[PDB]
Paper text:
The central protein in HR is the RAD51 recombinase. RAD51 forms a nucleoprotein filament with single-stranded DNA (ssDNA) generated from enzymatic end resection at the DSB site. One emergent RAD51 modulator is RAD51AP1 (RAD51 associated protein 1), a protein that directly binds to RAD51 (15) and promotes its activities in HR, thus contributing to the maintenance of genome stability. Our studies reveal that RAD51AP1 acts as a RAD51 modulator via strengthening protomer–protomer interactions, promoting RAD51 oligomerization and reordering its DNA binding sites, thereby facilitating filament nucleation, stabilization, and strand exchange.
Since the ATPase activity of RAD51 plays a key role in HR and RAD51’s ATPase activity is inhibited by Ca2+ (37), we optimized conditions including DNA sequences, RAD51 to DNA ratios, and salt concentrations that allow sufficiently stable RAD51-ssDNA filament formation in the presence of Mg2+ instead of Ca2+. We refined two distinct 3D reconstructions to 3.6 and 3.3 Å resolution. The two filaments have a rise of 18.5 Å and 16.4 Å, respectively, and a corresponding helical twist of 52.9° and 55.1°, yielding respective helical pitches of 126 Å (6.8 protomers per turn) and 107 Å (6.5 protomers per turn). Detailed inspections of the two reconstructions revealed that the filament with a shorter pitch has Mg2+-ATP bound while the one with a larger pitch has Mg2+-ADP bound, suggesting that in our samples, some ATP has been hydrolyzed, resulting in ADP-bound filaments. The ATP-bound structure is similar to those obtained using Mg2+-AMP-PNP or Ca2+-ATP, validating the use of nonhydrolyzable conditions for structural studies of RAD51-ssDNA filaments. The ssDNA is organized into stacked triplets intercalated by the conserved L1 and L2 loops of RAD51, specifically R235 of L1 and V273 of L2. Further, the β-hairpin and the α-helix within the L2 region are also involved in DNA binding. In the ATP-bound structure, the γ-phosphate helps to coordinate the H294 side chain at the end of the small α-helix of L2. Our Mg2+-ATP bound RAD51-ssDNA filament displayed a slightly more relaxed filament (107 Å and 6.5 protomers per turn). The ATP-bound filament has been shown to form on presynaptic (ss) and postsynaptic (ds) DNA in a similar fashion, with DNA stretched between B-form nucleotide triplets, the ATP bound RAD51-ssDNA is therefore ready for pairing with complementary strand.
Numbering used by the authors:
A (entry chain G), B (entry chain E), C (entry chain C), E (entry chain I), F (entry chain K): 21 to 274, 283 to 339
D (entry chain A): 21 to 273, 283 to 339
Amino acid sequence: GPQPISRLEQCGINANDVKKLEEAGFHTVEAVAYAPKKELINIKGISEAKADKILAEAAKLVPMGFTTATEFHQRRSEIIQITTGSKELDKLLQGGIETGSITEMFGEFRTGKTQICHTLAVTCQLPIDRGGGEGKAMYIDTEGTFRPERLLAVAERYGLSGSDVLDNVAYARAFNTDHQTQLLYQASAMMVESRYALLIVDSATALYRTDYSGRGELSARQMHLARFLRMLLRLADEFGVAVVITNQVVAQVDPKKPIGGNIIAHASTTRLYLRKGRGETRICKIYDSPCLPEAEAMFAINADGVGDAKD
Amino acid sequence: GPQPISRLEQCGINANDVKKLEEAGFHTVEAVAYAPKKELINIKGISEAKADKILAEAAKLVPMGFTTATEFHQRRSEIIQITTGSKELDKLLQGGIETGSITEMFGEFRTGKTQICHTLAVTCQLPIDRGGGEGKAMYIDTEGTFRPERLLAVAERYGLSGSDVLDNVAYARAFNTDHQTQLLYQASAMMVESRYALLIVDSATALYRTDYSGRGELSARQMHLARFLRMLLRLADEFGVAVVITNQVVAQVDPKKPIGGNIIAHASTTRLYLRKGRGETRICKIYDSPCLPEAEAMFAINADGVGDAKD
Amino acid sequence: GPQPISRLEQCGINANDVKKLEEAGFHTVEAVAYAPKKELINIKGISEAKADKILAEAAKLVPMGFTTATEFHQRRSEIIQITTGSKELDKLLQGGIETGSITEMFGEFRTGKTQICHTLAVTCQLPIDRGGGEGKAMYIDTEGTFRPERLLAVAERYGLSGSDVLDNVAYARAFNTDHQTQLLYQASAMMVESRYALLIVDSATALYRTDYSGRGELSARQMHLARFLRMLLRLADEFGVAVVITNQVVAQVDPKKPIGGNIIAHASTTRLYLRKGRGETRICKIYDSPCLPEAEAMFAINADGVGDAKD
Amino acid sequence: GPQPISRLEQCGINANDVKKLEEAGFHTVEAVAYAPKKELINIKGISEAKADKILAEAAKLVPMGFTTATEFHQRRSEIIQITTGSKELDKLLQGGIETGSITEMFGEFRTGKTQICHTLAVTCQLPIDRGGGEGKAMYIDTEGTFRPERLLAVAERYGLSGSDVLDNVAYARAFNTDHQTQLLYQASAMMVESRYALLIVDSATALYRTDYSGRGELSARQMHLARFLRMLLRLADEFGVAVVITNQVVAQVPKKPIGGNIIAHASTTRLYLRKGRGETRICKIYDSPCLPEAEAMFAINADGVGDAKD
Amino acid sequence: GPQPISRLEQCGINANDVKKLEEAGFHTVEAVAYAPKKELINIKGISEAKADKILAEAAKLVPMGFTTATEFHQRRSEIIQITTGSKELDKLLQGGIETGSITEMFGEFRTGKTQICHTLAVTCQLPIDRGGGEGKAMYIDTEGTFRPERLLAVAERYGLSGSDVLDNVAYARAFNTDHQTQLLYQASAMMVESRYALLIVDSATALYRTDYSGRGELSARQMHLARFLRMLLRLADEFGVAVVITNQVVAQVDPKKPIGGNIIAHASTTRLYLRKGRGETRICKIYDSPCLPEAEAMFAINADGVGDAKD
Amino acid sequence: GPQPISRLEQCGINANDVKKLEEAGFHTVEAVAYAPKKELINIKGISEAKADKILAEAAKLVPMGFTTATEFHQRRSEIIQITTGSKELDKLLQGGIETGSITEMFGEFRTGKTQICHTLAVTCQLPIDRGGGEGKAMYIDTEGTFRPERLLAVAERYGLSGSDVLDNVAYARAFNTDHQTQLLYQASAMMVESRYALLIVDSATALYRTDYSGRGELSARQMHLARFLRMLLRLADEFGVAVVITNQVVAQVDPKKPIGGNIIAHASTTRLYLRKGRGETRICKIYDSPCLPEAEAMFAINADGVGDAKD
DNA sequence: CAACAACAACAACAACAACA
Ligand SMILES: Nc1ncnc2c1ncn2[C@@H]1O[C@H](COP(=O)(O)OP(=O)(O)OP(=O)(O)O)[C@@H](O)[C@H]1O
Ligand SMILES: Nc1ncnc2c1ncn2[C@@H]1O[C@H](COP(=O)(O)OP(=O)(O)OP(=O)(O)O)[C@@H](O)[C@H]1O
Ligand SMILES: Nc1ncnc2c1ncn2[C@@H]1O[C@H](COP(=O)(O)OP(=O)(O)OP(=O)(O)O)[C@@H](O)[C@H]1O
Ligand SMILES: Nc1ncnc2c1ncn2[C@@H]1O[C@H](COP(=O)(O)OP(=O)(O)OP(=O)(O)O)[C@@H](O)[C@H]1O
Ligand SMILES: Nc1ncnc2c1ncn2[C@@H]1O[C@H](COP(=O)(O)OP(=O)(O)OP(=O)(O)O)[C@@H](O)[C@H]1O
Ligand SMILES: [K+]
Ligand SMILES: [K+]
Ligand SMILES: [Mg+2]
Ligand SMILES: [Mg+2]
Ligand SMILES: [Mg+2]
Ligand SMILES: [Mg+2]
Ligand SMILES: [Mg+2]
Ligand SMILES: [Mg+2]
């Protein structure tokens, strides 16, 4: 995977500066390479010449130049995709949930976003030949609606051992936006040691509705949301982990629209809209995607996770 | 239960600051740890560095990091469930009413929400081996429809002493939304000294239909409801008290929909829909739940509380 | 019982604000302690700080905290119930007509709601040891069907002097919904001087059928009805009077359903359904009650008021 | 009795506004006092402040406050009742037809409804000494069965002059369920210009069966009937006149009055007429807040209505 | 094409000076000619007389005097335009995308900016008689939204060799504003060696929203944006490449406006506004242009790229 | 017109001195007369006595003493004014664009300053009886926004031949502030040979925004702008040509302010402010003028140049 | 004494009989 920051120690860099970078949140040389000069200067005790030298030596460790489109196509041909637990949804997504990007599913209440998140979290531990990502998973839950019983049910359905799928899922709760960002920081610190494949944030904008209320607090809310989404995107680009976030809806009074403004719209790569059907059936539609045609699919949440409709 | 806020005094914090935090609403380390920096800053006489130290020591007191899913499963397997008073409904709920969450029962009038609330209030004092929670009950009532006669009848049915049942139930009445929020603040203040198991708000969204009228003040109504539900969620996560709220319905002109909107749709954890059949028989259906299948059950309200329908 | 606004003057407030509140409609410290901040702010000439100050002093005047259920039981056991003039109906209601809660009686035409209202108005003047409270009565009549000869007949049946029986009965006909609300305002203003025990509104929703017509203005009609019922409930709670209202019915076109929608259903406390029987006899059924079991009784209307059927 | 609306002109309201109100239909201060603010707003050119000011002044004009049951008892004892021409029916109703209220008479066809209406119309001209309010009658006839010959017969029976009896009877006919409302609107000016003691509608619900048909037009029919009955009640309460209306009957698949709950709840007194043997009929009180449920016997003689000749 | 800077060497200037100028970014005589004195002085190792001599030779090599308008008209008539992929859009721009200038397309999310950029990138390699520019395309992408599949689809639609169109497209990703600005130096370095006819930046102002947050950082953000746009304009004037930049949108909040401010408004030459209508159809409008009227052409994005709407 | 510098030689001045003056930038006797002693002594090879003789002879050639105000009034009535292409705007300016003075237009983007400049450039060549200046015109453009198509359209509107009108719009482009300033020397050199009546510069302060950045470079920027404006004023007073300049705008975060500071405010004589109205209609408001009062006017840029608004 | 823009969100209200 990514080269740890210890390599920078072998480039004429003092140990205390490396420790300062590590405690600032840059646990990988990729983070320092992608860091602008302002971020590397805002940390106290760092001089302009020191930051210039650090960036100069970090630029040699990772390629940041011009490459032909054929090389990019070859690189994209090795992108792992994780099955969503339904054959129809897998066909609709043309492979499944993509890694290295942000895919957000939004809809009304009880539509089935959390069930999909649970099924993805338990599925990503599967071997690659079976459609998994062959890695652990993380769940930063903000609504307190994490139920390991569903994970056990899906593990029983797929035949895996429940103990292992339980032991290979990190969990955390967010009580406020600041705690959410600190959880992202701790996830960045932790991910450098083991192999992670999924990172679920359900839901990303639940706490922003209550913490930032009113009109005069709109700009600060948008700035904080933008910083959070930028951190998520940086983590996805660095560690190559599939980031799945959940979004709510709001009324179109005088008819529902996803919340979060233009920041969430321009920060996501794939967007899915989930809507209610009849009894236990739900409909998924590709709201926005750079290479996926606008289509629809039908699914249902059975007693063993998400799957195809029992028609 | 939660550690009292006085422990913060043993972490180099002035007594007057702790008194200010207590008068602001925070009476435990958990409440302070769950609050963002904005809320603490909003208190007058509090500096930025002092607040940062306060949250630092609060986070040191109570863990907030990542834990394996098996630890969460072990924690969840030791959660008390309060019997609803009916065996069929107990089977439907897979244990009864769960603590630490929000259960909202809604339906038309005459369905039996108040009777269910009364039965839960009386039976939450039972020993754990009988399905109780072994704690005092609270009743914040807004419609002026609290009758101790039903509590006496259920106490006679289960055989406990009526005097102790009446003595171990706190009651209060709400005349407007502001008084409802102040009652919640007083409940937070008084819950830290004794052990409480249930907290009933019937109805949660009854006054909001009258105080806020018209399209002009819809946003203010939604914001106030969101703040009230956030306070309820904070109380539930703090003291581990089973919160039961009651909701009404509205007619779908051009056919009944629960009032409150997306705020109460997303704030609640478990939702039950109660409908009227014939005679004294009623039908309860699980509307929204993260780990409970959509099913139905039949019950009735006899002379001694809610129970199974006579066949 | 109620404490006039004058007591606020000795608590720090001046006289101009007291006069302004009296103009607004609050003639009691209880009535001003039951109002939200937005209601007092709407009175022009009152500042936010002044409103907070007066609300704090009013909350200091009357208790609004948490009380044990045993205290509520003691308070509830000392309320007065007024007999309806029939032994069967008195047994059915387990005491008669309560005070402090809304009792709605509905049925088809010719059924006999107005006779019951007249008999209750006469009985409202009986000594407390004979079946009724000790106070005067009112009659807001919106159909022009107030017949004093029935009052004289019932007073002769029980045995009283007709002069003071008729003297202690207010009356005011209503010609429109706005006039009805202004009549309620005048009743609230005038109730503080003397002792009142019955507030009859017959019919409560008779003018709403004609004043508001069509689907377009249904929401405004419902909002106005909700405001009227909220004012009625506030008056009943503040002055401790027995409010009795009458309601009409409509045919359930593909069979009688009371009019008023969910507002009247959720605003009332005791609902009775009166139905024509055979000849002169009628049957009264408990439609809805939080503590009275669903039963029915048999009665009639003789030449001297309502009473038990003669067999 | 009623105070002309011109008074409102003198207290600070433009004459144009008073003329507009008179055009709308409010010919009396009482008429504009009994109307809600919403109704007054619907008139174009009337502002919120102007409507509030005129409503407040009108409320200052009329005593809309709270009274005592003794005063209402004195007011009730000061009303007049009009004899129906039969002693049995006179004693059945404890007098006659009370003014300021609505009396609906219904039954099967050919049961002496129009005969009773004619006798009541001719009786209201009597001096108070022998019943009647000493006024003039109005006949809004919808069925077309108004014969100006029974009136002469009853006038001859009572000894009154025929020409004066026939002179003061304002007759009009309605052809659909839109001319009735316009006739009622026009009746306000005639009632404010001269004393009127009886308004007769026969039948109240006759054209509604044919103009409105099917389930689709049921709601509109009920709304229009409610508006018509509300206007009738407003006129009765305003001008202190007695309204007598005639209602048809419908079979049951066993006869019940038509009109639904609207006419049942909008009528104060209800009488049911049934046929017996020969030329004898029975009148029974259906719904009444004070009169007990009883029956009386009456016959339609060759001269007028009255007690049966036995 | 542009004359390489080596022609200066045989003009009286030292080769070391030419190398020093080369490392600064001036790889062409045109770049040195279009340079103020301070720009050529701030580079170390350059004297005043030496800079004056270099500027004198640069002015001698490149004509900078007045010219009759007919010659400019002829030169404008010899300007190549790149087919946009739609016939009505080609009619809208009176040809295609102009070369030697800056065109900026902006709109809300999922409106078709990236699809248009991809279609232009593949179309630029067409022979000059089919509307192409007969060169190579460069793609600087700042959102990770480059998909070679769309390029392959459009190449198959136009009957090209997919391998060649993949081999003749250069790609780069910008992880921060500094990297985005520094990519242009490499772009200029690699543009002289071969023939390039299209440079796409998508998006130009995406990273400035998050990197430069708050209010105190507004002036620095505007200065950096101005420098970046000036460098883009210098590239366009130097190598005669069609520069296509992408711009986002922002809400007004007491209704959407492009971001960037007056700098982007005045720097760009042609401005296009793209909006979404119904289904798969979009509307394109001309916002700012010196010689094109305000029209509202209409198009769509099918599986083979941009194209005409299907009725 | 102005007397050429070929008159000081036949007065006792060596031809070498005249050649030196011509090289320095002074091509007419008036330019040397207006040159102060400090400016002329800066020329290499010029002594104090030679300079004194030169200024003495120049002052002898052209009068510089006091003139009675009626002579100035007579000379003021012999000033040509150029029509702006709109009759209403011509009425607003009371004749048109005055010669021998500096006019400035500023506004937001797409407001229509370049269109007005093009219309003035093409109409300047009209005969005097039609409102033209009878002379040629020039165009020093900095943004590369010169489009001969608009000139051809207006020439078609006025009926003049396209080739003849194109052959007299000698145009140049400025790539930096130094080049923009040095273009004026060539403009003065070519102005003495033919008849010119326009010196359009669009825009004057475009390059100064990016060439000079930061607070440290403010004083040098202001000094250079002052020198450029002084050269423009000297040219206008020398050759009697109408100088028209275009100014950008900036926002007011603490709302539009023309850029350039007090130097351009105190240098320009007539300042007009252009604003965007609705659709194709624009509003022109006179900002600053010592002769005409503040007023507003309406115009529109149709498909064939600027003109009156379409009604 | 000069110069620099940006940020969305919130649901609710029932009613009308008739035909051998
Ligand atoms: N064991 C189960 N078997 C079948 N269906 C289930 C089961 N558990 C939950 N469900 C279904 O899950 C649905 C709700 O899904 P989920 O909790 O994921 O909603 P969500 O919209 O993502 O939640 P939220 O927005 O409130 O966070 C319910 O309608 C219910 O039918
Ligand atoms: N002692 C009793 N015995 C039997 N049934 C009873 C008794 N007391 C109340 N009920 C029943 O309670 C029912 C009403 O239920 P409940 O009082 O809980 O109201 P609810 O549906 O919660 O309505 P709301 O709170 O909106 O007024 C009635 O139908 C009545 O039959
Ligand atoms: N003096 C009396 N003696 C006996 N019965 C009487 C007497 N007065 C009225 N009634 C009875 O009253 C009954 C009607 O009751 P009431 O006047 O209270 O009507 P209501 O249905 O409440 O009125 P509404 O629906 O029109 O508002 C009639 O059936 C009649 O028999
Ligand atoms: N001159 C008369 N002498 C005796 N009886 C008469 C005379 N004129 C009419 N009648 C009687 O009048 C009765 C009909 O009464 P009336 O004309 O009032 O009908 P109605 O019940 O009002 O019916 P409709 O529904 O047609 O209005 C007949 O039975 C007839 O015997
Ligand atoms: N293969 C495809 N077939 C049809 N339409 C497609 C296909 N791929 C993407 N789309 C369409 O592309 C649209 C989004 O356009 P695009 O990807 O160019 O985004 P954009 O608005 O320019 O945003 P951004 O700059 O954030 O990428 C979607 O609405 C979708 O309908
Ligand atoms: K939920
Ligand atoms: K000036
Ligand atoms: Mg969920
Ligand atoms: Mg209840
Ligand atoms: Mg009644
Ligand atoms: Mg008739
Ligand atoms: Mg894009
Ligand atoms: Mg321009």
